[PDB]
Amino acid sequence: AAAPGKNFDLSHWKLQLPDANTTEISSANLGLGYTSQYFYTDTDGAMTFWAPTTGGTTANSSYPRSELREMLDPSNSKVNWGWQGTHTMKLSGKTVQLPSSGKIIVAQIHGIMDDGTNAPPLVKAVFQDGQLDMQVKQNSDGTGSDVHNYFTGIKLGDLYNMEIRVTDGVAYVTMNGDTRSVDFVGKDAGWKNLKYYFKAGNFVQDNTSTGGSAIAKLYSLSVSHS
């Protein structure tokens, strides 16, 4: 019954919560065994993220989350990685319960300005009962639309194996050994002006009062920069 920080390497993740005040838990406190209604180890050992649709939201989102936010430097969220080189997150997990909207985001690459100011998400792994859509943003200024990458057949409760990789300004998005790519720096050179961090957890795409809540699980989670 050990807390997730004992089962996963959370030394370079902080946790963002869907409580009224959108509390954050540090890497160190995750390692010490932080657990709550929003974040816990289930009977199957999974790191489990729960968030209600009525939860608190961050300053630039309509939606609540129980979600890890990568910290290259666990003591400074303004230290983030760039477009050049290779940057890889791998995970395995499942979504157990959806809100009324039937949509959550279970993994991301998020952009950020050099000064820590918000920038657009780059990759969003959107889960629905029957499909994961690994969406890649076109433009670094947040305008335009997203490039969709549909992986159909993935159901509620099914185990997915996922990888999101950036190598030299190209995003490679993988679900169960099936990989698609989007050259994001090639769509917009402006992406070279931004930095990036991974996210993984449960970002609930429903903020309605009667929308219920969602549960997402992870069985493995690793990040590498090379």
Ligand SMILES: O=C(O)[C@@H]1O[C@@H](O[C@H]2[C@H](O)[C@H](O)[C@H](O)O[C@H]2C(=O)O)[C@@H](O)[C@@H](O)[C@@H]1O
């Ligand atoms: O809505 C936003 O601005 C959020 O930005 C990111 O989280 C940042 C936010 O300021 C949050 O309250 C806390 O201070 O962490 C910040 C960070 O880690 O950069 C982003 O991860 C997401 O929560 C949302 O887009």
